[PDB]
Amino acid sequence: SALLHSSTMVVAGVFLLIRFYPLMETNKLVQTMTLCLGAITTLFTALCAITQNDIKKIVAFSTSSQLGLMMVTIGINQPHLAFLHICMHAFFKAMLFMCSGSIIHSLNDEQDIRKMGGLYKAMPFTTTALIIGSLALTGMPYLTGFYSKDLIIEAVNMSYTNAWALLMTLIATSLTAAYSTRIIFFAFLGKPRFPPLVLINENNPLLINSIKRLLIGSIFAGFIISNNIPPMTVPNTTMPLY
Amino acid sequence: IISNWHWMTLQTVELSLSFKMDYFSVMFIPVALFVTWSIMEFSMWYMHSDPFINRFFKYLL
Amino acid sequence: PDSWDKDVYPEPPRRTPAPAPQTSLPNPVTYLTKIFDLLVDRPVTLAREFIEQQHAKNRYYYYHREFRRVPDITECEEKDILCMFEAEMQWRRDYKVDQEIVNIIQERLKACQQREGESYRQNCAKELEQFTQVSKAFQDRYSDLGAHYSARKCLAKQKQRMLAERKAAKEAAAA
Amino acid sequence: YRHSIFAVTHVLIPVWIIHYYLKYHVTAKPYTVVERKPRIFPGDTILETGEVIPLMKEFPDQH
Amino acid sequence: GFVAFMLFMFWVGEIYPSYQPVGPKQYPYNDLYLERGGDPTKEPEPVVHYEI
Amino acid sequence: GAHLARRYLGDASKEPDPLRMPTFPPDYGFPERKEREMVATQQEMNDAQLMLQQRDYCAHYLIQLLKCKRDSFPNFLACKHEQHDWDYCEHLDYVKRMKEFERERRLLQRKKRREQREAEMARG
Amino acid sequence: MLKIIIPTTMLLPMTWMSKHNMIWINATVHSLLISLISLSLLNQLGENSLNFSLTFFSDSLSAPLLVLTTWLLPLMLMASQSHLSKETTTRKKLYITMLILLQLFLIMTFTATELILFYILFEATLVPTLIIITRWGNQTERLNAGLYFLFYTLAGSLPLLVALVYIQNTTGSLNFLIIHYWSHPLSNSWSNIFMWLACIMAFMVKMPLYGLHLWLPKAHVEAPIAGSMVLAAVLLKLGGYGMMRITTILNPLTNYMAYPFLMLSMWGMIMTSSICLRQTDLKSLIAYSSVSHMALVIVAIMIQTPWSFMGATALMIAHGLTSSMLFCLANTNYERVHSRTMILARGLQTLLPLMATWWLVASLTNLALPPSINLIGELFIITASFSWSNITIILMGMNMMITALYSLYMLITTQRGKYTHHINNIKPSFTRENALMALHILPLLLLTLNPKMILGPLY
Amino acid sequence: AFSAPAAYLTHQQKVLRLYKRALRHLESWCVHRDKYRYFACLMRARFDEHKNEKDMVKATQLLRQAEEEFWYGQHPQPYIFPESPGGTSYERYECYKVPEWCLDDWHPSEKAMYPDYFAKREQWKRLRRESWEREVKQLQEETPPGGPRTEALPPARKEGDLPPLWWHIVTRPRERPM
Amino acid sequence: SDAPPLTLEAIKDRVLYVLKLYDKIDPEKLSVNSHFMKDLGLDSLDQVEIIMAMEDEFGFEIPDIDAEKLMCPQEIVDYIADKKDVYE
Amino acid sequence: SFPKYKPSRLATLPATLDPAEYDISPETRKAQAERLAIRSRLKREYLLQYNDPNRLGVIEDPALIRWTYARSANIYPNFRPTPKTSLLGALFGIGPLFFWYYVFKTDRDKKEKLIQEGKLDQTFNISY
Amino acid sequence: EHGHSKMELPDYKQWKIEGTPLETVQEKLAARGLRDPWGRNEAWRYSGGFANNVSFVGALLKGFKWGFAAFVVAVGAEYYLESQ
Amino acid sequence: GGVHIEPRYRQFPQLTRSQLIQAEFFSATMWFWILWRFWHDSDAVLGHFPYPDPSQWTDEELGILPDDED
Numbered sequence A: 001s002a003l004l005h006s007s008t009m010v011v012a013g014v015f016l017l018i019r020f021y022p023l024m025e026t027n028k029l030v031q032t033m034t035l036c037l038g039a040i041t042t043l044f045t046a047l048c049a050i051t052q053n054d055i056k057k058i059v060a061f062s063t064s065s066q067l068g069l070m071m072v073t074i075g076i077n078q079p080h081l082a083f084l085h086i087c088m089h090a091f092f093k094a095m096l097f098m099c100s101g102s103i104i105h106s107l108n109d110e111q112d113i114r115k116m117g118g119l120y121k122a123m124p125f126t127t128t129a130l131i132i133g134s135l136a137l138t139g140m141p142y143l144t145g146f147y148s149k150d151l152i153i154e155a156v157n158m159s160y161t162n163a164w165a166l167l168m169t170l171i172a173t174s175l176t177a178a179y180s181t182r183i184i185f186f187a188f189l190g191k192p193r194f195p196p197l198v199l200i201n202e203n204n205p206l207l208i209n210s211i212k213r214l215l216i217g218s219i220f221a222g223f224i225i226s227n228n229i230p231p232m233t234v235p236n237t238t239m240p241l242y
Numbered sequence B: 001i002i003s004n005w006h007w008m009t010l011q012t013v014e015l016s017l018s019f020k021m022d023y024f025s026v027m028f029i030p031v032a033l034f035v036t037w038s039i040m041e042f043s044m045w046y047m048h049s050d051p052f053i054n055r056f057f058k059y060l061l
Numbered sequence C: 001p002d003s004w005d006k007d008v009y010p011e012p013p014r015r016t017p018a019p020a021p022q023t024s025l026p027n028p029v030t031y032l033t034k035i036f037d038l039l040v041d042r043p044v045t046l047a048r049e050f051i052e053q054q055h056a057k058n059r060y061y062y063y064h065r066e067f068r069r070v071p072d073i074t075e076c077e078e079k080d081i082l083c084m085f086e087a088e089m090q091w092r093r094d095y096k097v098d099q100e101i102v103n104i105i106q107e108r109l110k111a112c113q114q115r116e117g118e119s120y121r122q123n124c125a126k127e128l129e130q131f132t133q134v135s136k137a138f139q140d141r142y143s144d145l146g147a148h149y150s151a152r153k154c155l156a157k158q159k160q161r162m163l164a165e166r167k168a169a170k171e172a173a174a175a
Numbered sequence D: 001y002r003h004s005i006f007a008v009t010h011v012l013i014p015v016w017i018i019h020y021y022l023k024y025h026v027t028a029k030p031y032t033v034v035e036r037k038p039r040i041f042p043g044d045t046i047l048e049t050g051e052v053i054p055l056m057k058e059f060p061d062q063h
Numbered sequence E: 001g002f003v004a005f006m007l008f009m010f011w012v013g014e015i016y017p018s019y020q021p022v023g024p025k026q027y028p029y030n031d032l033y034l035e036r037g038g039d040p041t042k043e044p045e046p047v048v049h050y051e052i
Numbered sequence F: 001g002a003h004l005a006r007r008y009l010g011d012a013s014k015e016p017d018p019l020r021m022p023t024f025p026p027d028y029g030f031p032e033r034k035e036r037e038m039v040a041t042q043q044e045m046n047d048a049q050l051m052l053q054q055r056d057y058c059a060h061y062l063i064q065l066l067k068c069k070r071d072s073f074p075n076f077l078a079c080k081h082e083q084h085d086w087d088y089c090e091h092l093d094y095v096k097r098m099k100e101f102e103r104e105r106r107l108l109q110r111k112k113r114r115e116q117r118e119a120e121m122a123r124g
Numbered sequence G: 001m002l003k004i005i006i007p008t009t010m011l012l013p014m015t016w017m018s019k020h021n022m023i024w025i026n027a028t029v030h031s032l033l034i035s036l037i038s039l040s041l042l043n044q045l046g047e048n049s050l051n052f053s054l055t056f057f058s059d060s061l062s063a064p065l066l067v068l069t070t071w072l073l074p075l076m077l078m079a080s081q082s083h084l085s086k087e088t089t090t091r092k093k094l095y096i097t098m099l100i101l102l103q104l105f106l107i108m109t110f111t112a113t114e115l116i117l118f119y120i121l122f123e124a125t126l127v128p129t130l131i132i133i134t135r136w137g138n139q140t141e142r143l144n145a146g147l148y149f150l151f152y153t154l155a156g157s158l159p160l161l162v163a164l165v166y167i168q169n170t171t172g173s174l175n176f177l178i179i180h181y182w183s184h185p186l187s188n189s190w191s192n193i194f195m196w197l198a199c200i201m202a203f204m205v206k207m208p209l210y211g212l213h214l215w216l217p218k219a220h221v222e223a224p225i226a227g228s229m230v231l232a233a234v235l236l237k238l239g240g241y242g243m244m245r246i247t248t249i250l251n252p253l254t255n256y257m258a259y260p261f262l263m264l265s266m267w268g269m270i271m272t273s274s275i276c277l278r279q280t281d282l283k284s285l286i287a288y289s290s291v292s293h294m295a296l297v298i299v300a301i302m303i304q305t306p307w308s309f310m311g312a313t314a315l316m317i318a319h320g321l322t323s324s325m326l327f328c329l330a331n332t333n334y335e336r337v338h339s340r341t342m343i344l345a346r347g348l349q350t351l352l353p354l355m356a357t358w359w360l361v362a363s364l365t366n367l368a369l370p371p372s373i374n375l376i377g378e379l380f381i382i383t384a385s386f387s388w389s390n391i392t393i394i395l396m397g398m399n400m401m402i403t404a405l406y407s408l409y410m411l412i413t414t415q416r417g418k419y420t421h422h423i424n425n426i427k428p429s430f431t432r433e434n435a436l437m438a439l440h441i442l443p444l445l446l447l448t449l450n451p452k453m454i455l456g457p458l459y
Numbered sequence H: 001a002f003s004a005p006a007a008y009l010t011h012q013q014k015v016l017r018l019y020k021r022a023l024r025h026l027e028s029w030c031v032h033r034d035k036y037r038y039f040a041c042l043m044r045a046r047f048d049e050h051k052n053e054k055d056m057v058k059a060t061q062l063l064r065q066a067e068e069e070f071w072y073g074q075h076p077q078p079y080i081f082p083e084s085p086g087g088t089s090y091e092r093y094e095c096y097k098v099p100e101w102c103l104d105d106w107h108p109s110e111k112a113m114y115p116d117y118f119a120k121r122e123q124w125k126r127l128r129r130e131s132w133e134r135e136v137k138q139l140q141e142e143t144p145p146g147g148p149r150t151e152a153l154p155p156a157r158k159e160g161d162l163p164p165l166w167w168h169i170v171t172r173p174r175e176r177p178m
Numbered sequence I: 001s002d003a004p005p006l007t008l009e010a011i012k013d014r015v016l017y018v019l020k021l022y023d024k025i026d027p028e029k030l031s032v033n034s035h036f037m038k039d040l041g042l043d044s045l046d047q048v049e050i051i052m053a054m055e056d057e058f059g060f061e062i063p064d065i066d067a068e069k070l071m072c073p074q075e076i077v078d079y080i081a082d083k084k085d086v087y088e
Numbered sequence J: 001s002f003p004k005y006k007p008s009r010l011a012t013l014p015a016t017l018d019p020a021e022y023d024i025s026p027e028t029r030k031a032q033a034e035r036l037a038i039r040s041r042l043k044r045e046y047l048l049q050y051n052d053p054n055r056l057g058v059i060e061d062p063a064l065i066r067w068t069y070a071r072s073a074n075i076y077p078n079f080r081p082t083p084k085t086s087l088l089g090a091l092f093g094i095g096p097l098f099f100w101y102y103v104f105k106t107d108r109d110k111k112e113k114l115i116q117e118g119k120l121d122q123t124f125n126i127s128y
Numbered sequence K: 001e002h003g004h005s006k007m008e009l010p011d012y013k014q015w016k017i018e019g020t021p022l023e024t025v026q027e028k029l030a031a032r033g034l035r036d037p038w039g040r041n042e043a044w045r046y047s048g049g050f051a052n053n054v055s056f057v058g059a060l061l062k063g064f065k066w067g068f069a070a071f072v073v074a075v076g077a078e079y080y081l082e083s084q
Numbered sequence L: 001g002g003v004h005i006e007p008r009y010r011q012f013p014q015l016t017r018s019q020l021i022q023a024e025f026f027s028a029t030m031w032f033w034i035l036w037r038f039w040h041d042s043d044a045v046l047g048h049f050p051y052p053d054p055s056q057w058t059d060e061e062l063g064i065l066p067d068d069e070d
Ligand SMILES: CCCCCCCCCCCCCCCCC[C@@H](O)O[C@H](CO[C@H](O)CCCCCCCCCCCCCCC)COP(=O)(O)OCC[N+](C)(C)C
Pocket: G188, G189, G190, G193, G210, G211, G212, G260, G261
């Protein structure tokens, strides 16, 4: 779930539309269809996510919402920005799924969030990794998710689109924040609710190293890649302050 | 563009083993490899008790 | 490379910029390609020299087959089977040659599109026009013969097209 | 030692084979490997010719 | 009902798009005539853009 | 946005359609009508092969940005001034586009007011 | 061409004179050697053909079929050697004799420079198959199946003969070369319409067409393993070969007359693919899959374009190999279970992992997974049909979806899940069965490396 | 699971099942422990208001409107234990469960390893074989005429006897074989 | 997993622990073989609450048909040991 | 009171919401007892055949043979030409064929007419 | 190598309702006339290291103090270096 | 590959100083990165260039005659 259905395989279709972007820009109806499909997909998936109890289901719905955002970006004639979003989303969503799997293994193969309580202190490295990943996913300035999603939002706002698609993109961003804080609150903040036999353990170099590599990625890769690649589009240099 | 091996040619249509190394490929390959490396390092511990772990890693590769 | 002729597959003079390091930091690219050269290019080149000397020790040649010209289906009798067979074989050979010609033009077009990069739409208009002409000719020759195509069917299609052209020209002249 | 042998049985030999196959077989036929024709900017010079691209039109520079 | 409402409001948004208070983007050389399609032997109508 | 509300909730003819802008001739306002200036010619701007949509009046700053990016490769933060210059030129282009939109808008408003005044004079 | 026919004829004396416990070894060895000999026919020309003599000629359409026919006999012997263990020497030699006679008839049929000789051998192939089905069959319905498999065929083939001789009275020659070089257009007349039907339905019945596919499930289910292999792999391709050979004289009447059969095939592929979804028998499901694939081949042949013919040839070869493998796997399950029902024995991947891998590969290659030659043929036919009309793509895509669905359904029902508890006679798979699966599957993945070898004369 | 089913469910069994389902779904609704404790005690008090009721028709009217109310508020995504028939790990290890008779088909080179295990297996097979004839007789003599009425098996009554039909219950593979 | 191989001693210790935390039962009067309905004077609803406590303590849910006929802690430990295949 | 659950074909009535279950009677109890007796007899027979150490084969299941035979071989002998069956067979076996024939014929006549007028723009159309 | 250390269970009298929201539950239940029978079963969820909790905002700034100190030190160092 | 940690049965699990210090270091590093980027590059969020007011433009540079000339 962390490798195929979250970060690498499921973006493939989006990649296809990126590959044929010279033909994409010369057609207007197909672009509108792509934008509408992406908007409805991201809205519906976020709305389904904000009320799930399985953590893996919530992460999968978040991935689908991000894919819908990618499709919207393709529909608004920004294929390179969609590729950048793919690159950042792979990092932070893979690390988020790895954190989910670590928590899952620690609680003896328990997936429902109703049986997961106080883990902020019970498991600190997974806590900090999940916090950083959620902050990157929702979009924190100068994080790996900012350099992509902020530009996505600016391009959507500053271009000739449909009002409904823009509204659903904004609501999808709000719902993304909503399910991120839902995950954090229901899995890390309250009193413990797991069975009494505590088997929580993280002292394994493999898991720690694998999580921390993607942590360094999810913190620095956005800045490094954005400042390294050549400019491929006209920026929105002037903007209303609000 | 690396068109190395020539497959069947069908009248005026030519099919060959051709690889494209534009910005997209050369940028997406390192990220995918990094994520996959992290995933197998994690699966080392997560699949520690699975009898068919070698088959799992072969499937991932 | 002498292995292929430059005229059939033309290439631009391939001008490239000179390195202009504006700063004193050592770029990893130059050192990386130097170590790549030392570790890869030299052994491969030495092995190639060894193989080339071995090939030079035993030299032999092969020749491209030449075919005579034979009367085509237009000079064949209605039921004469020998000349019809010869004409059909010659027509099939010409069909294969035409397919290879279209393949060459398409190769030129693909190479130009990849080479000129962002300005492919403007800098490869000549190749597009060449392919348009050759594809129009090829389609006029063999578009609708279908399976079980033959020299007789191609000649019949050409006769139909030329009758239509003659009628149109006569109508236009007397219009 | 494990990494030393691994880097030569899993990297160096594949690079050797692929480099030989690309430089001496694939590049023998035309149009098999096609470049991008790297960008030419004003103020640059070409190694093949030695000529220098003329500079630009001296726009007014202010902020 | 959800699907029908989504489709109808998408059509409505198509009817009423969103944009910025700006004019069309201006392009220097005959709206990039030569680099978009080509045909240099036709001499298109010269378009001159506004200074403001 | 406010213009969207003004157009979809007010009078459609008051404000322009962005598809057909401009509608009125350029020199309608003043007879000076200075032309736009270009620094980038055809050949070197083709050689830089930036992009089809990037071939606008801010091309020279983009070309110099690419020069800096190619030259000072390992120090990918070395040339920050040229990015600022290209952003400044893009700002100027967008501001002139906004000025053109406002110009056509109040041209249309003045035309509508003049037509209403003429109709009132004819009726009276 | 006699360098292939004469060893096949000498296979008979060798079998009869062979020791009572050495028939299988000698037959397999010499059949494999004959296949190696017949491999030489693949070296074709871009010119007319390989005209050996006045009676036999070769072509790049006939060459892959001949190679497959020669290759099938050792596999048939290896599959049949199991269930004939308790059988007397004379009758085992008779079984091998029937197989050898069928191979000889098929080999002579695929060359057949003249159409009457082609018809004679094409109908001579019927007798050994009928004997095999009605003699070495398990169920009581085999006789009925045989009757069906007979009469259907004759119901289509007897008019053809008449048409054939009629043509020789008008044209003056039934030789394929003279027929091709002296072909003349068919006037749109009632007499020409009926001659077209007489020439066409004989081959359409054996593909089979969707309307005339009733005999195939019966014949495939009640026949033994060798009979099922030969029916699915080679005997179905006789109709396609005959159609591709005979459609030269049917133009331009083919354009008008192709519509009913095109509609029937395009809808019957969907019908049979859907039928595969609800099936309680493995052999019946494989038979209906064969019907769907041959309906696609019929569509390809009726479209009558170069890409159509190339895809048709590739699809026939690939389908023959795939169906033979599927029937072999089903027979390996049946020999342990003796019920031939999908839902009875389950979870066999737990007990037989390598056989589960063979099942997975067979299902994948039946699913038309690229770059397998199955996918090459399917894609060529799909593209040719799209060029013919852009609306066919809906039916083709639906067929692909249902094909994948029923293939993975067959795989999952038998290999995945929990094993049946009361079944305890599931012994480890033998070396013979695994070797049979490997010899079935390796040629497919080797042919995908050289597709032009099976793309036919229009390549 | 192990216990044989009955011909029908009594009223007390039905009310206990409803109590179990209602408390489980209330715990699913009430994530936190203190809230669940308070509302579960409230539900227990609501249930024990009618414990002493005697009219059977009124008792049947009860638990029925209760089941309807439960269905209306049944938490459409309830908590399920991982190994339960709806859990995420319901049949995870069923692919590793191999029958015992498979060992009878092992190659002699494989049986060369683990000799003590196969010796004990031989003793087990003999014990099953000697035991089986007696078990059939016990079942034949103990089964009421006209066939069994409930799928409950009797225990062993003699000294050397074993419970009838014991082989496939004792020889379950494992809960986690690998 | 990394789960220790729990033994019947541990299972009975945890069952008795859970039963001692049950304030309706005096800990000094409970016993391994002590019956629920008679020796401890517990109602049927209290028995099903004990079943719920065991389910939430051991991480698995006992089917109702088996749960409703478990009357003493000894049978509960025996049933859990059969479920988890406990050796010693 | 609460909103009522409405059963459907793909969403059947819940077991605890059936009005028939709460209508207990001696006849219903006897029927359930007989059903459980039949199930117990079948289970006893299966276990007697299953635990036998001498058996080294599958246990034949007459229910499975009956199911397969009724599905496959018992269809035609019980078939009767009925207006329902005749109409349904005619529809599902003829209607789709004529529908697709009309669709493809209309498309091909449109394409042929466009080719004859020459307004189709078949440039670069070489492979067919 | 597994965890065979013969872990011993704590004393059952250690778990008390006192100092927990289970007290508030019990007080609210007694105002109606009810007592909870499983209160001491779940006391361990509020007794040990689980007693002290953190807010979501406090969770967000897990390492804000050290990061801020490093930022001010680095800013001072850069200010003192560039001003030269 | 780790150290031996025993289950705890209803108490807070054993914690190693290594994981705690690593988590605190990573969180502090991310916060320092955010603050450093904000200090050095603040215009990426607040913007560097003012947004013009269309109504504040005087009528001369725009080209309007007082409603009578044209
Ligand atoms: C059962 C499972 C499948 C088995 C195989 C089925 C496929 C075989 C069907 C054969 C195709 C149709 C046969 C004739 C087609 C000719 C075209 C015709 O349909 O169109 C009109 C023909 O008009 C009418 O159709 C006249 C014929 C009507 C009589 C036929 C019976 C109709 C239904 C019977 C179906 C039963 C077929 C199977 C019998 C066993 C055009 O009118 P017209 O321009 O003037 O005639 C052109 C032909 N000319 C030039 C030679 C004169």
